[PDB]
Symmetry: C2
Subunit: 365 residues, 2 copies
């Protein structure tokens, strides 16, 4: 038996109310056939930004939809190349973001996540360290679950202040932002109000695929500041005319379903696995790194005098447990990741607990 | 009342047997959910290349799957940019191919479709006119329905001979190739056998979204020659890890359904609309251009001393009929396209017939 705890894609099963969505897939199909594409785009975008509490995005009504967040990222990549912009990119970060931008020949330079830990040091650290015209953040971050929302509004406000002051393009990947929702202290505020009010040049990417168990039948959203909107619109329309109205109709049901249960069916699965990993590996050579935000991945430091993350990945995979070593997140210098391991949490809790038992057995040598 | 005959996306409704696929979407969901991603990739790729009769592609087993043909095209674009290659691209052709490659800063130079009309002139015409390192064809072509398959095997064989002899990367978009299938004289042969045997450097793109009424819940396929396979694999993997196994499972049922009826439910709808347009517009200012292949779009020349395609589009859209001016297909020189109009055929026949009656009414006023 193999245990894939590697990719962060959703592989948990449907909740009871989500099984009701599955049951009406035929009607969702025939509805999308009879209705207008624009209707399903509007209903999806409205449901999404109502759940995420981003009302400014619905007033501006300039958001464009694509097959996946990486496709939105490639549209951003075309804009970066057209404007001769290099990117300072968050590190650590899931390295496919580096890979796709590097494959588009965007020059890329790291900035360590620790620059954002102290709210009163964010602005001077960016002034000293950001030497490109574009800054690309992932918030909450993958793999660490870090979020500027630890600082309330002020963390994002300081980043936006820096980028506006210095005429930088601010790109933000909000794929994990659903995991802040309904949190008493961390629930995201209206980011588009801040982005619009500041006049900063920006590209904001949102996603459905990591939140819901939709088997990667998904939709991503990109929103651009008004000054670049037309250029980005034309870039986007060269990639695709439309996302499937069937998929949009289906995703709208998942979004509405999660508004009704305040994301309980998502949060409860991740919590069960996060807590199982924490308890099972407490005191082991894999040291759990508590995240700011309860995201769908768990991050561990290797605590051993000799073994590295490469060793831990090898030993676990030999027994059928597949995790990702940190080389896949320190994209500018993979050797820096040899002290870390990431595990995916969007999984069925039974398989996950069996994987945790086997993992502890292996680590106990 | 609006009649969208512009984009070529499939908007016809489901056949009786396709309705049985829609009715089983819950079952197809749970299959993919409990199953392995690689299972649904393999079963889809097998069904697809069985229907298209491309057995070599299944032996090589190196084809990669993406959300849509434009995404596969952007992977090819990343390869073209990494190698710093200029492209000679077929003209006319749907200009989104030009747009996405131009937006990736790929240099693009046109070659007219007519270089392929005479099989014994293909090679010398390419030697004169292809002065870049890459050649990008669309076969069958959009909007004209032209295909090298009018020449049997020999048209493609001459193109491949040229590209091999002169060290050209050959890119081919096969998205309209389903419309050749089961044709007595035009059915595509195994293209991958020729591409592999020749040793030519190539990128080949296949599609589902224009064939079946799957509401753009679709999948495209890209296959590279062995010498560039690893590079292209790494480029492709940076774009996506996987296509939805639910979508793959669903699409596999459409492919199998059309194997069972020899694509009749697709062909008959397109033929009904093609014939309606031909009969309705016979003798009008829109001169039907008979295609080599019965593709899902119809192409017309504007036969008038003053009126352009832009004028025709304006007049028709004022009464709610939306066609495309040919400017959107002469991407190197859009004015050339003001002599042509394209109409989408993948449409419910009753809507299409009403659109045709209104179209001739509008045209009969000028
Ligand atoms: C915060 C974030 C992610 O974590 C993420 C994806 N996570 C991944 C890649 C898996 C490998 N991806 C690949 N090979 N192309 C992960 O396991 O963390 C993406 C991209 O989303 P799409 O793949 O385009 O749907 C965007 N923002
Ligand atoms: C031969 C061919 C096509 O005709 C075609 C698409 N036809 C179109 C563009 C519609 C507009 N597309 C856009 N704005 N991106 C048409 O109406 O002919 C595509 C690309 O397919 P995807 O859109 O990625 O699914 C590839 N090969």
């Amino acid at each position: 038996m193999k245990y894939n705890l590697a990719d962060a894609h959703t592989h948990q099963r449907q909740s009871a109310s989500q099984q009701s969505i599955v049951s009406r897939l035929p009607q969702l199909w025939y509805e999308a056939e009879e209705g207008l594409q624009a209707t399903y785009e509007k209903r999806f975008t409205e449901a999404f930004f109502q759940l995420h509490r981003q009302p400014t995005a619905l007033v501006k009504n300039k958001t464009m939809l694509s097959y996946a967040a990486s496709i939105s990222t490639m549209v951003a990549g075309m804009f970066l190349k057209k404007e001769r912009l290099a990117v300072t990119l968050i590190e650590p970060c899931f390295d496919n973001l580096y890979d796709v931008l590097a494959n588009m020949d965007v020059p890329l330079y790291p900035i360590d996540e620790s620059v954002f830990y102290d709210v009163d040091r964010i602005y001077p650290e960016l002034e000293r360290r950001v030497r490109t015209d574009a800054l690309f953040l992932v918030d909450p971050n993958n793999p660490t679950g870090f979020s500027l929302l630890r600082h309330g509004r002020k963390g994002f406000e300081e980043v936006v202040r820096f980028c506006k002051d210095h005429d930088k393009l601010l790109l933000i990947d909000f794929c994990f932002a659903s995991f802040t929702l309904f949190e008493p202290e961390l629930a995201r505020f209206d980011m588009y109000e801040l982005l619009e009010n500041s006049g900063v040049r920006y590209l904001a990417i949102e996603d459905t695929g990591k939140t819901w168990p939709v088997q990667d039948a998904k939709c991503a959203l990109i929103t651009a500041s008004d000054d670049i909107w037309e250029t980005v619109y034309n870039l986007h329309t060269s990639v695709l005319l439309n996302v499937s109205p069937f998929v949009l109709n289906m995703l709208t049901q998942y979004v509405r379903d999660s508004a009704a249960d305040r994301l309980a069916s998502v949060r409860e699965v991740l919590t069960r696995n996060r807590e199982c990993a924490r308890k099972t590996l407490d005191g082991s050579i894999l040291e759990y790194q508590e995240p700011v935000v309860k995201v769908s991945v768990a991050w561990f430091r290797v605590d051993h005098p000799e073994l590295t993350a490469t060793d831990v990945h090898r030993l676990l995979s030999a027994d059928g447990v597949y995790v990702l070593p940190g080389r896949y997140f320190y994209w500018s210098e993979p050797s820096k990741g040899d002290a870390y391991v990431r595990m995916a949490l969007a999984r069925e809790p039974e398989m996950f607990a069996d994987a945790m038992a086997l993992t502890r057995q292996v680590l106990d040598r």
